[PDB]
Structures are given as C-alpha cells and as structure tokens.
C-alpha cells in the first residue's frame, strides 16, 4: 500500500544505520549477506553461534582458493 | 464525474478558488510551529478574534514566487493596486506562523517592483528614437536570459525536494546586478530635446563603467556597446558619405552631448565637413 | 492547452481562444480550471496568434487575386503581391518553432504555459512592431513606388529582428522593380501597368519625378531617362 | 520479507509539511503536471457546457472519438481530391477542417481539367498543369504518412494558396489559340517576379509550341495549317 | 559569509527527512561560528565606531589577521589579498 511503504521507508533508514555500524566494524558481509543475517535476527538467534560458523566459512572461502 | 473528477485530482483547486485546503499532515512540534503557536495564543486569551487566512501550503508559495520573479504578475498572490506591489495576508502554512513569512514575501515584492517599472517602459515601446530602441534591445536581451533561470527552476518542481532558502540564496548574484540597473535607469527616468534626454541617460553608463575600472562591469559594458552603436554608424556615415545625419535632430553634434567622443570630436567634424566640400568639387 | 494553443497560434482558432476582429484572440475568462496565475501568460501568448491571423489573411488577400484585372490600381498590382510573398518567407521560423513545440509535447506534455512563453519571447517583440507597417499599407491605400519608401523608413530602427525582417521584404519588392527596369532601359517597353515604377524619346517616355523612392537620388533617374529615350530613338 | 522489499529507492520529493515519511504523493499535482489527457477532459467539459447552453444544436466537432492518426489520414485524402466523410470534396478541429476542405476543393478542379485527352495548345497547357500536380502529389503522403495534424496546415500554406490561384487559372468557355496565347502572355507580364513566375513561364513556353509549328507551315511549304 | 550560507542549507536538508532533531542540534552544530562572528564583530565595530575610510584600514586589518584563534586568523587573509588586488590596478596605472 502506501502506509506499508512509509513503514518500509522507516525500515530502510534503520537498515542504513545498521549499515554504518556494519562498515565501521569492517565485517566481510556485504549488503546482501547482511540481509540474510537480519532475517535470522528477526526469528531469534544466538549470534555467538552464527559468529562461530561465519568465522569458519570466511576462512574456508580462502582454504579451497 | 469523469471530467470534474480528473480536474479535482490532478489540479489542486485550493489556493485560488473558494474551497478550504486539505493536505495530509505530519504533526508533532518540529514542523508544527504554526498550530502550536496558535494554541499558545488562544490559551493566553487575546481575547480571541482570529486572522482571516485560508491556509496555503509551502510549495505553492514557491511556484507563485517564481512566476512573479520571471516577469509576469497579476497572479492570485501579488496583485497591483496602482502599480505598487502588495502581499496577500491570507497566507499561512502549518509552520512559521506567517511572521517571518510576511517579511520574506515583502523582499520578493520589492524585487517585483524593480521588474514592474521596466515592463511598463517596455510595454510602452509598442503602445524609441534608434538609441532608445537600441537601449530597449539591451534590456530585452537581459530579460530573456534572466527569465530562463526562473523557468528552469520551476521545471524542477515538476520533477525532487526544493525549499525556500535555497532558491532565495541562489538568486543573490542576479538580484544584485539588477539593482545597479535600477539606479542607472533612475537617471534615465529623471529626463528638453530627445537628444538631451538621451545624453542624460547615456553619460551615466560611461561614468558607471569607469566607476568599476568582476561581473558588473561586463554587464554595464554590454549595455554601453549596444547604445553607442547607432552613433558609430552615423559618424562613419558623415565621414564617408559626406553628410550630417538627420533624425529629427537625434544626432548629438551641433551644426546634449556626452564626454565620450569629446576628446576626438574635432577630428570628426574636420573630416565630415571636408568630405562634404569634396562632394561639391 | 496542448493541441489548443498550437491550433490557436497557427491560425485555426477555437472556442477556448475565440477569434474576434476587434480583439484578436481572447480566452473566455474564468473557468473551474483557469485561474489568475496562468492567465497573464495566456494573455501575452494570444498576441502572436492575433498578428499571425492578420498576416495570413493579408497575404491571401493580395497574392494571386487577379488574372490581368475591378479597375482600381491602389487595390491591385505587382507590388502588393511582392510584399505578401516576402512576408510569407519571413514567417517560416514561427511555423518551425510550433512544430518543435509539438515534438516536445509528445515527449512529455507536462510543460507549463510559461515555458512556451519563454521559447516564443523572440517573436513576442517582432510581431507587434511590423503590424503597424502592414496596417498603414492597407489603411492608406498606397499606390505606386511609395510602398518601398514606407518599409525603408521603418528599416532604420534599432531593433535588429524587426529591421532585418522588413529589409528582406524590401529586397523582394526590389525584385519586381529591377524586372521592369530590365525592360525600359533595354528597349523602352513596360511590364507593370496601372501601378507606378517611377518611369512612364520625348513625352510618352518622360520621367515621373515625384513618385521616386527616397533611397535613390534624382541624378541617377536622369541617367536612366537618357538610356531609355536614346534606345527608343535608334 | 521486509528486506526482500527493502532493496528499492525512496522518493526525492519531500516537504517540511511531510517529515514523517512521504512515499511521494505530491502537494496535489498542478495543471501542467498532467497533459494531453487532462486536455481532452476540460475540452469535453467545455463542449458539454456549450451543448447545454445551446440545446445540442451547436454541433460538437470531434468531442472524443476519433483520435489523431485516423483523422490525419482523412485530412490527407482530401488533398488527393477523393471522397471523405467530414471534409469537402477538442472543438478547434472545425476551423482546421474548413481550411483543409477548401484545399481539397481547389485540388479537385485541376484533375477534372486534366482527364481530357479546345485545340493543340489546350492539350499542351494541360500537360504543363500536370507538372505542378506531380510536385503536389510528391509533397503529400511522402512527408506526412501519419505525422502530426498541424504539419498539414503548415506544409500546405505555401502550396495550398498557390493551388487556389491555379483554380482561378482554369476556367472551371476558356480561351484557345492566339486568344489563349495572348491571355497567358498578359499573365507573364502581370506576375513577372513572384513565387508564381516559373510555373507560368513553363506554361507559356509550351503553350506556344503548337503555334510555332503552325506558323512554320504556310511559309515553308505553301500549304495551310 | 558563503560558508555561513551553506551551513544553513545543510540543516534544513537534514530537517526535511529527520523527525527527532531539535534546537540543540543547531546550537551545537553552529558553535564554530560563535568564534568567527564575535571576533570579526570587533573589527567591523572598530571600523564603524571610529570611522576609517582611508588606506589605514589595511593596517587595522593586519592587526587582527594576526589572530590567535584560527577562524578570525584565516578569514581576514582572504579579504586583504583582494584589497591589495584593487591597489594593483592603482599601482599599475601609476607605474
């Protein structure tokens, strides 16, 4: 609708604030992979448990390279 | 009802016709200063008696101002009562309360007066003594390029966020050069023979260029060049064609005159008359 | 606005722009879509179409209207045709501008009325000026060589569009005078009847001194008169 | 889901009446924030008011239906001088309609004069008339096969007026022989430097082509022609 | 004064979108121009109060373009070069 797009505008703002905080902490996640992790964070997640897998697959994107 | 409905939608119809204005509003103090101040005024008990205003929004002021600045007037806002600018007092937005507002539109009306005096002269060209015509041509060449900017900014309202303080600030180096013309033209409004009335105007330009001897100087330069253009032609005509120019005594030489051609004038006369004495030989 | 403005300015007016013979073009005033902001721009725009309709009526009126003669000579003759023909050639960029306006309207029709006013400001000064020249030509019923003087006097101004535009018409009208001059100096025969071309051995071939144009001295008229009389003699 | 949607771009239009997220709606569009549609709507409303205030006898000229290209082709066919439905053989359309109808009425009176197979100078005169008819045929349908309606009125301003002069040139007796040879001769001297000069010159140059052969007979062979 | 114009456009451009910004943001953000303006105020009020319109205006400029705070130290350096630039037409028509 229109009121469903003003909310999504206010969500686009928030995602850009989290984008600033993402880039000054220099995460290897770009805008697309971070959009998977925010959907995970909506359903409830332990980011210590996600962080242990992401710290391994990022070292295993260069292991078979 | 198929025509009126499209009219109702895709034309505003609420600051120029008898219809109360509606627009969806975003309340809450940071943009609500007018309504907040209204409620404050009523709570202090004036006692009440409101001001007659119909509530016009923000962008409509911008469109109306741009048309006033382009050179046209007699819009719904900014009418003349004898040829003197006058601001409507029914204007108020949901912000600023219309106290700073009456002042910013007063400055815009003050520039509209400067354009009104010029348009009165330019319209009375059609209902002009070849130097006045060449002066009108300089004014007109300024007016077309000047009108371009005001139309081009109005295009970006049809596109983009636009507010007042940008388009006012943007036109500062244009409204500055216009005031110089408002003072040079006042000496050509001050007024004898039409060549005396022309010299009283023409010497002001020749003085004003040496006054800044930049961007003002190139403007005054281009106004000067196009108005001594008849005279350079007619003095060359006196030299090669061997006759004094008759224009119902529009010519400045006595056979009332500016200091431009004075230091070389004897060489003009002593060439023209000597050529005329060759025509008889 | 989109089709209507171009249709009115081109000289095929409608009921939005009601053509009068006493005010030209005129909008029918207040509507529930017409309001004082656009009104002044509309009023300024109407002047161009007013002068244009007058021009085309005049051109049709004096071009191709006879087949070698009622019997008047101030309402007929080659100089009137030549004036109308020259004015038709000068009016070409106005037609071209209206074509380009329609192309931009097709690309996007959200162009404001003041935008069109901004493009057409260069005809906005040219059209009211030339109107009094052509109006004086009709009203005073001018006969003979004086048409040349009338346009030559207004080509002494200080507005370059007006001056160049009238000067071209005077060159077109020079064409006819040179064509009759190719005859009278070379044989003595005339081509223009009932309208003067500032020349009629002796009488029945004499000089008509009074009608002669103002940019031409009397001395050269004496030389022309010699050539024609002598070539007729031998 | 929010992020599936999120990857769009927000509008640049914003106001200081609209700080809480305008998705772009406007301050209600101005008159010239719509065009070529709203045009037809106010023209239709104006026409309806006219029809009411008259009684339906004012005759709406194309209130809606038809559109542009079909009307252009109908306008084109009158210049071919053949049958149409609203021309002789918005509401500004009637004024253009009358001018294009009058273009067609002077086109028709030349092809009618050029279907003939009076004298030999008559056939030469007609064969010269068709030399301008060919230029007119090249002018129409090649430049505007469907192109804009007003381009017709501008294109045949310089040419339709000349064609209307050619309507006065033809009789629709009309002279023949030496009578016609002096008629066209006086047409040369009356219009000797104009836009009508080379067409009349080409007419006079070939309408005397039979006559010179007639003169060339009784002197050169002693047998009358 | 043009960076005092630009620094006013930036605020309004923020406020058109941002809903929660308040008076404190402007008071905070324009704190660096509470050093430029009060310290060039004494220069302009010095030239008005005792009227200076000679060529000794330039010495009074060179006393405060010494500065001590960087805004009033670097602002007048822009102005003085333009003043000498007009005198470089005077001293070329001389020379």
**CA B100/CA B37 separation, integer angstroms:** 13
**CA B94/CA B98 separation, integer angstroms:** 9
Name the residue in chain D with its Cα closest to that of A37.
D3
B120-146 residues labelled b (16+ CB within 10 A) or e (exposed): eeeeebeebbbbbbbbbbbbbebbeeb
**CA C170/CA C152 separation, integer angstroms:** 7
Establish whether chain E is in contact with chain B, requiring a minimum of 3 CB pairs below 8 angstroms: yes
- Decide if B169 and E9 are in contact by the 8 Å CB cutoff: yes
Determination technique used: cryo-EM
- Decide if C109 and D35 are in contact by the 8 Å CB cutoff: yes
- Beta strand pairing status for B79-80 and B85-86? antiparallel
CB of C123 closer than 8 Å to CB of C59: no
The angstrom resolution of this structure is 9.2
The 3-class SS string of chain C reads: CHHHHHHHHHCCCCCCECCECCCECCECCCCCCCCHHHHHHHHHHHHHHHHHHHHHHHHHHHCCCCCCCCCCCCCCCHHHHHHHHHHHHHCHHHHHHHHHHHHHHHHCCCCCHHHHHHHHHHHHCHHHHHHHHHHHHHHCCCCCCHHHHHHHHHCCCCCHHHHHHHHHHHHHHHHHHHHHHHHHCCCCCCCCCCCCCCECCCCCCCECCCCCCCCCCHHHHHHHHHHHHHHHHC
Among E17, E20, E22, the strongest candidate for a mutation testing the D interface, having the largest count of D CBs within 10 A, is E17
- Decide if E19 and B165 are in contact by the 8 Å CB cutoff: no
- Decide if D165 and C64 are in contact by the 8 Å CB cutoff: yes
Name the residue in chain E with its Cα closest to that of B166.
E9
Q: For residue B94, give the DSSP letter.
A: S
**CA C47/CA C25 separation, integer angstroms:** 7
**CA B165/CA B173 separation, integer angstroms:** 15
CB of C73 closer than 8 Å to CB of C143: yes
CB of B160 closer than 8 Å to CB of D12: yes
**CA B2/CA D36 separation, integer angstroms:** 15
B154 touches chain C (CB under 8 A): yes
CB of C169 closer than 8 Å to CB of C151: yes
Question: CA torsion, points B205, B206, B208, B213, in degrees to nearest 10?
Answer: 140
- CA dist list (Å): D191 to C3, C64, D185, D195, D196: 38, 9, 10, 9, 7
Cβ atoms within 10 A of the Cβ of C134, count?
A: 21
- Summary count for chain A: helices (H), strands (E): 3, 0
Phi, psi of C24 (to 5 degrees): 70, -130
Taking Cα atoms as reference points, which of B62, B163, B87, C209 lies closest to residue D12?
A: B163
Of B13, B74, B136, the CB nearest to C39: B74
Answer positive or negative: Cα dihedral of B257, B262, B266, B272.
Answer: negative
B28 touches chain E (CB under 8 A): yes
- Decide if D28 and B14 are in contact by the 8 Å CB cutoff: yes
């Amino acid at each position: 609708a229109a009121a469903a797009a003003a909310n999504l505008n206010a969500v686009r703002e928030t995602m850009d604030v989290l984008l600033e905080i993402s880039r000054i902490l220099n995460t290897g996640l770009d805008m697309e992979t971070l959009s998977i992790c925010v959907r995970l964070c909506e359903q409830g997640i332990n980011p210590e448990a996600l962080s242990s897998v992401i710290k391994e697959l990022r070292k295993a994107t260069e292991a078979l390279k | 009802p198929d025509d009126r409905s499209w009219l109702e939608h895709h034309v505003v119809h609420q600051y120029w016709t008898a219809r109360p204005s509606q627009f969806p509003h975003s309340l809450h103090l940071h943009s609500n200063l007018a309504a907040v101040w209204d409620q404050h005024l009523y709570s202090s008990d004036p006692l009440y008696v409101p001001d007659d205003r119909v509530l016009v929004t923000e962008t409509q002021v911008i469109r109306e101002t741009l048309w006033l600045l382009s050179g046209v007037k007699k819009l719904f806002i900014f009418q003349l009562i004898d040829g003197k600018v006058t601001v409507r007092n029914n204007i108020i937005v949901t912000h600023l309360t219309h106290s700073c507002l009456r002042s910013v539109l007063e400055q815009i009306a003050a520039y509209g007066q400067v354009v009104f005096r010029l348009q009165e002269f330019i319209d009375e060209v059609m209902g002009p003594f070849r130097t006045y015509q060449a002066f009108m041509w300089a004014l007109y060449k300024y007016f077309i390029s000047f009108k371009e900017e005001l139309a081009e900014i109005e295009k970006c309202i049809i596109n983009t966020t636009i507010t007042l303080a940008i388009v006012v600030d943007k036109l500062a180096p244009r409204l500055s050069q216009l005031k110089v013309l408002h003072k040079v033209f006042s000496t050509g409004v001050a007024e004898t023979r039409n060549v005396v009335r022309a010299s009283h105007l023409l010497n002001t330009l020749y003085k004003a260029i040496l006054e800044y001897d930049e961007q003002t100087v190139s403007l005054l330069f281009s106004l000067w060049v196009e108005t001594v253009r008849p005279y350079l032609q007619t003095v060359d005509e006196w030299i090669v064609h061997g006759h004094l120019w008759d224009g119902a005594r529009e010519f400045i030489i006595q056979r009332t005159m500016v200091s431009f051609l004075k230091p070389v004038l004897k060489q003009i006369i002593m060439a023209g008359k000597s050529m005329q004495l060759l025509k008889n030989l | 606005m989109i089709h209507e403005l171009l249709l009115a300015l081109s000289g095929y007016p409608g009921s939005i722009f009601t053509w009068n013979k006493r005010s030209g073009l005129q909008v029918s005033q207040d509507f529930p879509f017409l309001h004082p902001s656009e009104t002044s721009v509309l009023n300024r725009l109407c002047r161009l179409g007013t002068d244009y309709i007058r021009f085309t009526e005049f051109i049709e009126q004096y071009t191709g209207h006879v087949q070698q003669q009622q019997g008047q000579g101030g309402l007929h003759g080659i100089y009137l045709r030549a004036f109308c023909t020259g004015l038709d050639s000068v009016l070409q960029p106005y037609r071209q501008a209206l074509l380009d306006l329609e192309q931009e309207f097709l690309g996007d029709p959200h162009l404001s009325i003041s935008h069109v006013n901004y493009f057409l400001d260069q005809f906005q000064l040219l059209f009211p000026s030339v109107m009094v020249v052509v109006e004086q030509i009709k009203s005073q019923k001018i006969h003979g060589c004086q048409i040349l003087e009338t346009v030559y006097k207004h080509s002494c101004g200080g507005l370059p569009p007006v001056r160049s535009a009238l000067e071209k018409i005077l060159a077109v009208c020079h064409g006819v005078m040179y064509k009759q001059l190719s005859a009278w100096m070379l044989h003595g025969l005339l081509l223009d009847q009932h309208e003067e071309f500032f020349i009629k051995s002796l009488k029945q071939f004499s000089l008509r001194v009074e009608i002669l144009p103002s940019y031409i001295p009397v001395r050269v008229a004496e030389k022309i008169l010699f050539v024609g009389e002598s070539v007729q003699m031998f | 889901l929010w992020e599936a949607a999120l990857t769009y771009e927000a509008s640049k239009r914003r106001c200081w009446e609209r700080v809480g997220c305008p998705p772009g709606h406007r301050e209600e569009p101005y008159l010239t924030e719509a065009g070529r549609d709203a045009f037809d709507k106010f023209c239709r409303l104006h026409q309806g008011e006219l029809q009411l205030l008259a009684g339906g006898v004012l005759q709406a000229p194309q209130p809606v239906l038809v559109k542009e290209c079909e009307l252009v082709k109908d306008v084109l066919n009158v210049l071919i001088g053949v049958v149409s439905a609203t021309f002789s053989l918005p509401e500004s359309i009637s004024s253009l309609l009358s001018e294009v109808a009058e273009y067609g009425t002077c086109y028709t009176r030349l092809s009618h004069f050029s279907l003939q197979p009076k004298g030999l100078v008559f056939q030469a005169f007609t064969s010269g008339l068709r030399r301008y008819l060919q230029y007119y045929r090249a002018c129409v349908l090649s430049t505007p096969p469907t192109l804009s309606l007003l381009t017709i009125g501008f294109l045949f301003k310089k040419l339709g007026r000349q064609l209307r002069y050619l309507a006065e040139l033809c009789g629709v007796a009309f002279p023949t022989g030496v009578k016609l040879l002096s008629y066209l001769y006086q047409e040369a001297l009356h219009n000797c430097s104009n836009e009508h000069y080379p067409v009349l010159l080409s007419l006079l140059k070939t309408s005397c082509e039979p006559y010179t052969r007639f003169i060339h007979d009784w002197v050169y062979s002693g047998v009358f022609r």
